[PDB]
């Protein structure tokens, strides 16, 4: 019982464009996360390749055990390999072809310690079912969502404290004269795809040899609704603002204990430490997914009870979040 | 250098009795990456798990599956564990084992001499 | 599922210097996560393998332990007096398949031929 609530809103007036919404549920035990996977009951279905298998790599810490080092408090990392159904793994053009084919992608970011996972349910639909408003039932789990369409006081605009907002910085704000944003990687090989290339310029981090680092870009949703977001593009600063927000902020914007630091082998079959992370012991916080940097090929990294590496100074033994939300500033002006 | 578990209790208790056992620490700190758990061996028969707890900062238990409900486990200071058991009957007769490990199940750096608990009328 | 844990021999009789062979197999695959341990009567028992294959700190390199999968061994070399006891498998599982595959060996009796 005791459903929990997925807020979306929907604009009166319609302008390539899908809305999205979020929640944050309680934690629940890490053992019945496995072969969990949305079960929808909308009228739109849901993506068939979320609910697909997406090899995983589990990295867990655990107290030492060989005698007398353990009496050191001294610990040690395992890495496996797993099968994930239903992360927000997003494919290449994944979005539009949802948007075409009036089908629903529901996906789940998982937030764990070494015990215990909070999930966080992401559904994102186009703005066709914001006329119909067709209520939904969706279970994951031992949870239960609530499918509410909300319907605010704005043609096409966002509510920001009480006020609608258009993000437009075109010719067309000219003569008119914090916004929420989440975001998924998707991994896709390519000469266009340079993702550090752009990072080794905009931030100053010593990153050399780019070419065997990972490859895709990010796909950010602004303001609940708006058009899907390529990231990085150098004509959108937008999307720029959204980049330097990923990476000043890679864990996020807004207890926990922390244990010791670790290494661990991504692929679970490297020769060497490929991957730095930080233990710790708590409630479950921030993102346990992630993809290695040091990889063409996505590996796709979960440490439930590790924080891994974001700080990228070094690229040796460094990661990028799966998913991020937050706020960026972005130019704009209010109806009226 | 010695460290090592110590079980306590353990006396003849009647069937659907009830008994609390308690797990000491010698020359050990406790630490938070450490896992205590008990484990007991019937006569003729093989190792039981029981219980563990996560015995840091945060509370965290696992019990097992027959274990469930019948079974108590708790941390009570820095240095010691218990177990409380209830409804005993002659199958629970065994001796009962203080373990430390990393996981929650796993390996158990660290063992005790153990208790026997007699459940006899 | 239930997880049940075989092993085998119940009892072994080899002479000083010889070698004992115990075979450990799980219903459920394990990725080489498996333990040995020694029991003397009275005594605490004694980890001397730990991940299936890592001799545990202050244990002789006379016992190896091999196995990867559902199958698994322990082979003791040299064998000594000391060493007939009762001896026993533990399969634990982590992150995901906690509890999962968690049970421990029947348990095997060494009796060393003098």
């Known amino acids: 019982r005791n459903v929990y609530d997925m807020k979306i809103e929907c604009p009166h007036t319609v302008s390539e464009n899908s809305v999205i919404g979020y929640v944050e549920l309680p934690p629940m035990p890490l053992a019945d996360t496995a072969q969990m996977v949305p079960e929808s009951s909308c009228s739109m279905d849901n993506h068939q390749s979320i609910n697909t298998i997406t090899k995983y790599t589990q990295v867990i810490w655990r107290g030492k055990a060989d005698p007398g080092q353990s009496s050191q408090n001294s610990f040690e990392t395992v890495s496996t390999e797993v099968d994930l159904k239903g992360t927000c793994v997003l494919k290449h053009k994944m979005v539009e072809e949802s948007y075409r084919s009036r089908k629903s992608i529901t996906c789940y970011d998982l937030s764990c310690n070494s015990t215990f996972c909070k999930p966080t349910l992401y559904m994102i639909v186009p703005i066709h079912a914001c006329n119909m408003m067709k209520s939904c039932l969706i279970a994951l789990g031992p949870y239960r969502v609530q499918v509410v369409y909300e319907r605010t006081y704005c043609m096409t605009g966002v509510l920001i404290e009480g006020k609608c907002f258009v993000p437009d910085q075109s010719v067309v704000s000219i003569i008119k004269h914090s916004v929420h944003v989440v975001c998924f990687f998707v991994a896709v090989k390519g000469n266009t795809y340079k993702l550090f290339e752009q990072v080794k310029k905009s931030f100053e981090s010593t990153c050399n040899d780019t070419e065997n680092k990972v490859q895709g870009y990010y796909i950010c949703i602004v303001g609940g609704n708006s058009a899907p977001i390529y990231v990085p593009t150098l004509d959108d600063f937008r999307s720029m603002e959204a980049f330097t927000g990923i990476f000043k902020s890679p864990h996020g914007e807004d207890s926990y204990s922390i244990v010791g630091p670790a290494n661990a082998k991504v692929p679970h079959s490297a020769s060497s430490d490929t991957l730095s992370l930080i233990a710790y012991s708590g409630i479950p916080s921030y993102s346990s997914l992630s993809i290695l940097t040091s990889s063409t090929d996505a590996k796709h990294v979960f440490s439930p009870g590790l924080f891994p590496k974001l700080n990228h100074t070094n690229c040796d033994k460094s990661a990028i979040p799966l998913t991020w939300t937050g706020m960026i500033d972005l130019p704009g002006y209010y109806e009226g | 250098t010695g460290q090592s578990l110590v079980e306590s209790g353990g006396d003849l208790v009647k069937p659907e009795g009830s008994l609390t056992l308690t797990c000491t620490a010698s020359?050990?700190?406790?630490?938070?990456?450490?896992?205590i758990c008990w484990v007991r061996q019937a006569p003729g028969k093989g190792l039981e798990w029981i219980a563990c707890?996560?015995?840091?900062?945060?509370?965290?238990s696992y019990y097992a599956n027959w274990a469930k409900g019948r079974f108590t486990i708790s941390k009570t200071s820095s240095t010691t564990v218990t177990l409380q058991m209830t409804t005993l009957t002659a199958a629970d007769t065994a001796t009962y084992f203080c373990?430390?490990?990393?996981?929650?199940?796993?390996?158990?750096?660290?063992w005790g001499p153990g208790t026997l608990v007699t459940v006899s009328s | 599922t239930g997880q049940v844990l075989t092993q085998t021999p119940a009892s072994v009789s080899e002479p000083v210097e010889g070698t004992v062979t115990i075979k450990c197999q799980a219903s459920?695959?394990?990725?080489?996560?498996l333990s040995w341990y020694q029991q003397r009567p009275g005594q605490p028992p004694k980890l001397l393998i730990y991940?299936?294959?890592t001799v545990a700190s202050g244990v002789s390199s006379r016992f190896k332990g091999s196995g990867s999968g559902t199958e698994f061994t322990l082979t003791i070399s040299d064998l000594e007096c000391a060493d007939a006891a009762t001896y026993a498998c533990?399969?634990?599982?982590?992150?995901?398949?906690?509890?999962?595959?968690?049970?421990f060996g029947g348990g095997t009796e060494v009796v060393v031929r003098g």
């Open positions: 991940d299936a294959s």
């Open positions: 020359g050990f700190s406790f630490s938070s990456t450490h896992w």
């Open positions: 707890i996560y015995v840091g900062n945060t509370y965290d």
């Open positions: 533990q399969s634990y599982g982590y992150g995901i398949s906690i509890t999962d595959n968690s049970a």
């Open positions: 373990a430390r490990s990393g996981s929650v199940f796993g390996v158990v750096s660290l």
């Open positions: 459920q695959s394990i990725n080489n996560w």
